Structure formats: structure tokens, C-alpha cells
Symmetry: D2
Subunit: 376 residues, 4 copies
């Protein structure tokens, strides 16, 4: 019963019971000696099946999401990939139309070849999920807020919709992190993250994390992980644990700057509109406040055209033009350039700019972006 900032330091198991080392040892090892045949010395026999450094980060994400079983994968895509392989051929899964672009690509071009049929639904309306549910629908996949336009979906209702129809509810909590949003506490079966983003938070790990409280769903995830082998390595597991330590402090510095930056974007004439769940005029803004304690650092705002966005990027000094988000350094991107009907259903327009607020000084970030907008 510790507070969130305390949970990030002592939640789970990140110490060495053997030597007392206050950080998780990095087990660069493949196999483990057995004193007697079949008798494992500490539960370990082969690192693909289980590795102590990986089990440590798996116990952390489980503790942060108030779950019971954690799983670490080589990438957030590998985590999503392992989750959908819970379904069989002829099975059916519903997602929000505005999922992360890589998620759309994986389910439409990879997993449809295996007999999994996919339906996309603007989940901002809860009952619209029920329109697309079939007697073969087994999974409801929610990504709130979405990438990169931050559409909010009612998690607590989607869980009830999933629970009623015998559906496996999944939430992609990458943008909110366990520090501000806990889908497992709202009835969801499985929560997953792209740990590449906020959790690692230092632009130096590609990883995915999955957590659940259901036993039999966990034994199925462990079976898929051990049989498809998309496991996170020990070195990356350790850097994940290390980065998670400062998640609360990083999110709070990010949230402070998000406040000041939004107030500047909404008052700058060179900006057409701003997209963020903290805005009262934003769609489903009251749903977000009911299910989340804070806000993501991804902000979307549209200038007039793509060429103005390229000029705006070249005018800044602290915003790094690159992919990914949630890092200590602020990142800037043009989602349209980094099919057209799906891109429009994701909210991506020309002149749409996505920023990821870092942990630099607030006034420095506001005045840098504002001075850049003055040139348009």
C-alpha cells in the first residue's frame, strides 16, 4: 500500500537476494547448472523460457499495473503480436480505427493471412463496439489515448462490453504509462505497453511489456512467448528497470510543460487547433479524467500545411526531429510523412505536427516552440 512514486522504486523484485545488490544483476547467460537432473537450483534452466533479469522487469510491470503476471518482449510490436496469437483461425478482433500505425499494419497484412478477421471501430462511442461484435469475436483491443491524435475511449465501459460478450479485453497503455492510467483496475484482462517509449524513457531500449491478473491467460502468454521466442534480452531488461525508476518524476515534469505549452499553442495565431485530452473542448475529455490521474506528453497541433511544419521544425532548437516518443529529450514529427482513407480515419492531416514533451526546462520549451511559430 505504497504511493506511486514509492511503487516505482520498491515495487516488484529488483534486488539480489544472494549478494544483497540493490540493483538487478544482468544475467548474460543462456543456460543454468542443475545439481540434480530435472531439479532446478532457483527455477531457471534456459534463458528463453526464464531469465532472472527479465523476470525482474516482468515483476515490476505487474506491480505497477496492479496485475499478477508480467511478460517482457523484444518490442511493443512483439508484445501485441504475442497477444493476438491467443486467438485461432476464424477468430475475430475489434480495434479502434485510429490505432498506432504499426498495429494496423500487423493485424491487416500479417495476422489476416492466419485466419484472424479484424474490425475497426471508432471506440469514442462505446455502443459502436457492439455493432461489430459477432459470435466469433473474442478480443477487444483499445489504445487510449490514440496515436497521434489522442482519441479517448471509455476503458471501464469497454471492459463491461467485453465481459458481457465473452471477449478478452486489451488496452494499449503506452501513452498514459502505469503512472497515470491502470486498465487492469478497470476490469480489463490484459494491458500492454511499448516500453520503448515512456517506461524506458531514455531513447535507448526497444521493448514491450504485457501484464495481466488472470492465471490461465498468463499461462497462455508464457506458452506463446516460450514458443515464438520474442523475448527481451537481459541487458535491455536491466535498462528498462533502470528507466522505470524515474517514470513518476519524468511524467510530472512532462505534465507541467504540457500545461504551459498547450496554453501557448491555443493562443498562437499560426496554430489552427490543438489536440490533447486535457482540453475541455476535446472529445471525451471527461472520460479521461474519470480513468486517468494525469496526462501523456504527446501533443498534436496543426499548422496550415506540410511546408509550414517543415519550416517550424527547422526554427526550433530543443525539439529533435526523429521518430518515437516519451523520451527525456523532446521529439518532433510530422505523422503524415513519417492508405489515405485510413490515415484520415486516424485523424492525420497535412500540417499536423506531433510533439513529445521531454524533461527540459518548461520556459525553454515554450519560448523555443513559440519563437518558432512566430516565423510562420
Amino acid at each position: 500500500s505504497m504511493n506511486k512514486k514509492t511503487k516505482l522504486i520498491h515495487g516488484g523484485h529488483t534486488t539480489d537476494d544472494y549478494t544483497g545488490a540493490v540493483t538487478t544483476p544482468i544475467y548474460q547467460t543462456s543456460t543454468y547448472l542443475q545439481d540434480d537432473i530435472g531439479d532446478l537450483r532457483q527455477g531457471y534452466e534456459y534463458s528463453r523460457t526464464a531469465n532472472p533479469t527479465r523476470s525482474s522487469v516482468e515483476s515490476v510491470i505487474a506491480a505497477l499495473e496492479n496485475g499478477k503476471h508480467g511478460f517482457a518482449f523484444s518490442s511493443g510490436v512483439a508484445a501485441i503480436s504475442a497477444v493476438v496469437m491467443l486467438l485461432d483461425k476464424g477468430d475475430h478482433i475489434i480495434l479502434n480505427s485510429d490505432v498506432y500505425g504499426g498495429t494496423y499494419r500487423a493485424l491487416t497484412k500479417v495476422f489476416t493471412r492466419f485466419g484472424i478477421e479484424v474490425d475497426f471501430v471508432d471506440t469514442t462511442h462505446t455502443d459502436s463496439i457492439v455493432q461489430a461484435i459477432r459470435p466469433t469475436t473474442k478480443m477487444l483491443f483499445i489504445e487510449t489515448p490514440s496515436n497521434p491524435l489522442l482519441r479517448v475511449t471509455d476503458i471501464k465501459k469497454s471492459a463491461e462490453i467485453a465481459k458481457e460478450h465473452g471477449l478478452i479485453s486489451v488496452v494499449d497503455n503506452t501513452f498514459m504509462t502505469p503512472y497515470y492510467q491502470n486498465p487492469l483496475d478497470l476490469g480489463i484482462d490484459i494491458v500492454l505497453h511499448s516500453a520503448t517509449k515512456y517506461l524506458g524513457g531514455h531513447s535507448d531500449v526497444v521493448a514491450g511489456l504485457v501484464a495481466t491478473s488472470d492465471d490461465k491467460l498468463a499461462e497462455r502468454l508464457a506458452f506463446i512467448s516460450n514458443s515464438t521466442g520474442g523475448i527481451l534480452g537481459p541487458q535491455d531488461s536491466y535498462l528498462l528497470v533502470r528507466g522505470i525508476k524515474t517514470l513518476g518524476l519524468r511524467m510530472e515534469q512532462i505534465n507541467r510543460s504540457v500545461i504551459e505549452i498547450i496554453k501557448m499553442l491555443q493562443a498562437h495565431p499560426a496554430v489552427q487547433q490543438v489536440f490533447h485530452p486535457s482540453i475541455e473542448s476535446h472529445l471525451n475529455h471527461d472520460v479521461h479524467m474519470a480513468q486517468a490521474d494525469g496526462h501523456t506528453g504527446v501533443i498534436a497541433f496543426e499548422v496550415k500545411n506540410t511546408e509550414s511544419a517543415k519550416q517550424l521544425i527547422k526554427a526550433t532548437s530543443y525539439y529533435t526531429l526523429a521518430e518515437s516518443l516519451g523520451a527525456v529529450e523532446s521529439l518532433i514529427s510530422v505523422p503524415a510523412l513519417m492508405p489515405a482513407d485510413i490515415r484520415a480515419k486516424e485523424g492525420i492531416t497535412d500540417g499536423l505536427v506531433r510533439i513529445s514533451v521531454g524533461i527540459e526546462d518548461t520556459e525553454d520549451l515554450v519560448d523555443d516552440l513559440k519563437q518558432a511559430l512566430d516565423t510562420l
Copy 2:
């Protein structure tokens, strides 16, 4: 032009063109700065899609297997699963009946749920491969030698059948390594490895490696890997590059010990049978010699019962009771429990490994 031991040191790109560093830099990084929107400074944009350290080890395995493209995965099992995902629902795969247990598990328990069926066949007689071909068969997947009995399958003839019948041929070359056997040179489309074993060589990396010369197949593997993200990390990529450097020396010490160990086992009163492709009476022995320039370090032999096998392990001093194979240290196991005994010959002193196993067998 470049001999084998030289190719292990200089094959592929394992140096830094920037600073001139003689080893591959470890790029613990997720993303890369772009000078202009879509203008990649060195071709890198996101580490899942491409990472310079991973591209280094990927260029090594393609060079060592005489392939055009290489792919590094987070485990050998992940390399297999990416290859199997080349197919659609309804497709069939033909495999050797004694295929690796993890491959059996992944195909029967996972990929059959997606309509991909597998047909187990004694591939030591190539006629059995043809008779099991269905109109929906799309892939031939073989290991040679297999585990743990080391059964040899004709690679060249398997490549001809897959070619004549329009199948994607796959060879798991883990046990032999690129230092002794190159399936791509024998007509196979895709060769893969559990780099966890010999390639890494030091019992400290879990990894898979895939190589092919087909552009359309590599483009499909690249798309599959980017969309399922079973990516090998940079630090493991580096240790893989580092371990491969001594692959030729390790294999050669392993093969010298295998000769003396088999000679001891064949004569010991407590041993009833020895399994290894280097024995002239082994099935398809000449087939192996025609497709391989050396031997694997995995040896299986039989003793009376599992009790004598367990007492054998405790009586040894230099054989480590653990899973896995292909490491610098010698490994021993009883496959039915994890009287057949399987050993992995390491790079310890040859007479030390001979005397130590013999004195332990003397206690039975």
C-alpha cells in the same frame, strides 16, 4: 579469395567507419535524428526496423553462409517462427520426424491454430519427402544432423525436390555452423541458426540468425520481422559478433576432441551404442561428407539405464549438467528427462575430456 578463418575475422562489416574503431559500436539507442523529414543520415530511423549493431551481425551471417541478406532475431525459436509465418492458413510444411522439440511445440501447439499444418517424415530417405507432398504443401524444413540421434538428410537432393515442386526449402544449420556446412551453396532458399549455440559460443546469448539470397524472400522476412518485432537487441548483437570471431578455432578444437571421445566410447564396456555422423556405419554418412567439411560437437551414446546415466553425470568433473549445446564448456544431459546420454563437446583439453568421461564410465 578469403579463406574460412580469415572470413570470420573480416567478413561482413564489424568496424566503425566513423572513428575507425575495430569492433562494432554498441548502439543502445531507439531513434535517430533526421536532417530533413524523411532524410536518413545513414539509413537509420528506428531501431526495431534497423539498428547498426544488429545490421553488423546480420551482415556477418550472410557473409558466412554466402547469402545476400541476414536477419537477427531474439532467439532461434523466433527465427523459426518468422520463417514459418511466410505461409498462410492451409499451407503445409514437411519436416524430419525427429525435429527439435521446441520446433515441434511451436508448430503443433501454435501454428496449427492458424491453419498451418506440419507433416513429419523420415527425411533420411528422400523418397518419403516426395510422397508426402500435397497440393497445399509450400515449405520443406529440415535439420541435419538432427537432435539427439544425429540423423543426416541429403541437403542437395532436398533442394532439388523443393525446387521441382515449388517449395520454399529451409535448413536449420545450428549443429554444423556456417564453418562446415553452407545450405545456400547447395540450393536451399533459407538457412537459419540458433545463434544461442555455436555461433555465440559462450553460453551467454539467446539469439537466432537467418540468411537467404532471395530478394523477394528477404523482403518478406524483413516485413515480417518489422511487424512482429522479434528483434535481437544491440548488446546481444555485439556479443554474437564477438563470439563468432573464434568460431573456426572452437569448432576445430571441438572436432579434434570428438574423434578421441568417440574412439573411447566405442571401446568402453559400459557403452552399447554411439550416434554421430563421423562413424562410417552411420546412415547417410557419405551423404554428410559430401555436403559438409567437418562435424558437429553433439554426441549421443547409450548406457544401460537412466540410473547409470545419472551416476555418469555425477562422476564426471568437466561436464556440466545443463541444457543447450555448442558452448566453450562441455555440456551433458539425458534427453528423455529434460538410458540415452547426449554430450556437447567443448573446447577443454582433449585428453582431459577423454580421461574424465572414461573414469566416470568406469564407475558404472
Copy 3:
């Protein structure tokens, strides 16, 4: 131009100009290819003399301390020993009497054997520094605040004395970090850190960092380091760069908890005294506020006897009984045994650390 939190993210060179990678590549390498004999492709020839990952963290500490040159050592003790080796036999050093125990050991037990003598002086009264100056005195070395009582020494006035008397002034800025106190801006010649503590921040790196603006001193430190080889490795260099990124956020959470923890300790019946430079009755409190923009996370308080102190540690839940300080997790110790108690405030929840320490004190 660049504020403090921004300088922690973008100060120094912590990106790859080659591929555009946003984090410093880890150069696990020993040597570098030369295009021509003596022609360094990027200025690197041998990793002991210079390593690009180490040069990254070296450029960070110089930027954060407003210095011209930075030096990364394998421990804070190694950073101190390189600085002390600037002197010759017969030279003298003036230090605060309560200097770090490892510094006491290194100077009295090691460097006196080479003729370098040390004069311990209560530097909280700057007059005592002048009266201990000999004709052979060459260096003034101070820590502020000190361990474990947190005694404050006037940095500006110490810099004037060293300047007026021709001494090399050194300040151990470990406890305050570059985020709150910059001795080089106050006239000190050399500032050093045990990066093992706050800079690394995560209890997983042993390192020392040195910064100076003097070219002739930096040239001498560079020669000393290349000829004694107390070099920080590349992997530790990288984790140092990574940990420093959150230094501002960690210190600020630590300082918020320090305020509430001191308020609780000052009122608890079981506490007889609290030591911290943030108390207005602390000796040289206004001196600290004039040379520092914040506070350290080390707090010392006194309870009845060592028994009550030991029972305090067992009664807590979030305080880790271990050596060291400045980590994300809270650390507690009894200095006389490794009733004075020293705690290191971490980044846990403020009320959690307040309530947990109070309920433990309630059991005494």
C-alpha cells in the same frame, strides 16, 4: 541561454553525428584504424588515452560545471588520487578535518609514503586555513557540505585564499552536484565528483568525474590519467550519461522530501538533534545559501544510542540499510559502525518516506 533542466538533456555531446543516434554509442573497443601512420580518422588512437563514450560523459561534466575540460575516472577515489598526484614529494595539502573517510585513508596511508603531507583544519572558520599555510603548502582541498555532519565551508573565500597564496583549490562537490553548486564559477581551480552517488543516481555505477577550466592543469590531469590509467570504462561512461539526464528531476524530488523529513525529525520525541545545511541555526547556513541554489539529500540525526538506531532501521520499510548515498532508493546507515544516524533521501513518495520514518521512530 540554456536553463538547468535543458542543459542536462542537451549539454555536452551525447549524440552520434554519424548515424544521428540520439544517445551516445557504447564503444566497447580498444584501438582504432589509422588511414595513415599518425593520421587519426576522428582523433582516437587508443581507448585508454581517449574513448568516444568517455569523451561524451567528460564533455557533460565540464558543461554542467561551466568548465573547459572534463575527466572520467574508474571511481571517485581515483578522481581524488589523480588530483593529489599533481603534487610532488614534500608538498602539503589543507583539508577540512571531517573529510570523507576514504579520502583520509588515501592521503594518510598512501600519499604520505610519497612525501605528500596533509594538514587537517576546521575550514568552517576560514582563518584556520590561512594559519596552517606553510611555504611547502600547494593545495587546498575541501568538501561542503561534509560527511556526515554537513559542515559548510565558504567556497568563495576559500578560492580567494588559494589564489592569494598560490594554492591549487579543489572542491569535492559530490553532495551538492552541479545542479545546485558550481565551485568553478566561484573561483575554484578544480572541482571533482564521486559520480557513484548522485550523478549516476541509480546505485549501479562506480565512477569519478573531474572538471577544470585551467588548460595547464587539464593538460597535467590528462597526462596523469594516461600514465596511471584509472580510466572509466565505456559501459559505465554510458550509464553515467544516462543517469545524469534525470539529475535535475531527482534532486528536486529529493529536496522536497528533505523539507518534510527535517520537519518531522525536528519534532519527534526520539530525535535529539538534526544536521542539515537547510536549518537556519546551522553554522554557515547563510554561507551555503550564498554559494548554492539548493540542498543535498544526505541528512544526519541523532537518537539515544546505537541500539535505538539499529531498531530504527529494522522498523522502516522503505529505507535500505547499505553504504553509499544519492541513489533513487532511500539509504540509511549508522556511520560509527560502518547514536548518529545518516539517511540518504531518495525519490520515493514524500509522505511515504515521512510516515515510514516516523512510525519507526515511534517504536523507540
Copy 4:
């Protein structure tokens, strides 16, 4: 009582007693939890004083050199630096005139300022050591074979000379490695290595290793290491252990190529002379065979002038022009360009070329260097 190749795999302690992991865990940690105050859980309290990954490589070098105590330092220079700090001001140490250049620089320009007086002696004649021994001489420092001209010194005699006069005998065994030469078995007190070279052997670690069998000399080295802090990190300790595993196989492939390469250099008219202890006409060649089981991979040979050496380097394809030696890749250097009286006493002339034989194919290395010499 295992053979050398077996000793490199199982000598010392490189496994995890806790989990059974067959490789040493990497303890990226600074401090260790204590269950009771002052009571260490497994002997660890602070990583500068002791770290489990470092203790593992320290137990390896001790086992390989038949010593009892090992010490790992941040560089071979830091190892030598810690060894000479065993002496006091006014103390006296004898070295061979042709020591490694960095050793000469460290003792002449650093440790002379602390009262340590240094004497250089052509140790190829044993009694010449006795000419320079004073009532304040405390240490005899031998580097056989030398860098880069490979002058051989009688180890067994130098030990007797040191033992008679109450001297601390030290041998720099970098070039021979513990696989071929074991100074501790010949009476020497302290053996040290630049583990950067052959031991690591993969051009990716800078490290130094020290070993001794005397208890009180070890307690003094541990005191200096803990008080001057030039400790090797855990990641570099691990890569050292990993590289040491293949030391025997790498040395034997190197020795095979050294044989074939020397026979080519001695028969090429473009080569004036060749320097290697395996040559019968080489100085003290019979001393080497009496104290060493094999040969180093460093070979020195002189072409006519410096300009011919630069042309020879540009003609090769498998020889890497860089510093350091003992790596899997073959390295080539010109020691004169990478005072004049000391350089001449070290045997360094113009046109002198130093090669470090790698583990590439023998015929490839011979024909590559030979074809290059044909252009001169």
C-alpha cells in the same frame, strides 16, 4: 590438476552458485543490502572494494598463473601503477631498458616526483642487475619478451637475484600470457598483465590484471586498489572472462601462423632481419625455451626505411594499421612513429615494423604480407 585448455574453462569461479548460471553475472551495482548492520550477506558491501563480477576475473587470473590472489584494474598501466606504489619515497626499482614505452614514461615522469628512483638495466645479462642494486633497492621489474623487440630475460635467475637481496620481483607477462609462461612458478613474487591485449583478445576491453601468491603483498595491493580506486568495471570484467575462455585456442592458431610467417620474412630479400624469440640466432633463445611453453604473436622485422614501411602497410589487405596487439585481427604498426637514446636502447630503428599475428588463416596471412613485401 587439469591441463591448460581445461583450466581456461573451469579454473577459478565463473558460475553463479545462486541460480546455476554457467557464466558470471554482470553486477552493475554500487552497494549491497545488509540484513544486519555490519553483517555482509555474501562478503560484499561496496563495489569499489569488492564486486562479484570483478572477483570472478580476479579468481581466473590467479588460477591461470598458479597464484592465490588476483586483482583487476582499469588498465594494464593502472596495474603497474598500483604495483610500484608498494614502494615508499627514497625507494629504488630496477627495470629493463627496453620496457614498454608507457612503463618508462610512468616511472620517469610520474613516480620520480614521489621519491622513487628508477634504474634501467639491459636484463639480458643477469649479473648486470646486480651492478645497479643499492641498499635502498626494493623491486626488480622484468618485461620478457620486451616491446617491441622481444628481448628475453632469465626469469628464474632474476627471481634468485631478487630473493637474495630482499627484492620484490615483478614480471610483465603480457606478451606470453599465462598459457605459455608462468612467472609465479619460477619464484617471482608478482605477475601482471595488460589484459587489453591477448587475455581479452577481442580489441574491446582496456584492463589490467595482477596476481601473486604472497598473502601480505596481496593485502597491500588490495589496500592500494581500494584507496586509489583504479578498479575494473563489471562489464569489462565480464568481457575479460569471456575472452580468456578462448586464450589457448587463439594462442595456438597465432603460434602456427608465427611459424609460417617468420620462415617467409627470413627468406624475403626485402627484409633486413627478423626479431622473435623462436629464432635460434635470437639473443637468449635458449632461456626462452627453458621458461616458456610457446611463443608470443608479436613479430618485429625491419625493412630498409620508414617510407618503405608505409608502402608495405598500404600493400597489405588483412593487417590493420592501429595500436595495441594480441587481438583476433592482425595488427601492424611502426613503433618509431606510433627521446632518441632511449628509443635506440629499446631496439627501435627506422624501418622497424611490428606485427601482431591474428587468428586469420595462416596461408592468407603469409601470402598477404609476402605479396606486400614484393612491392619493395
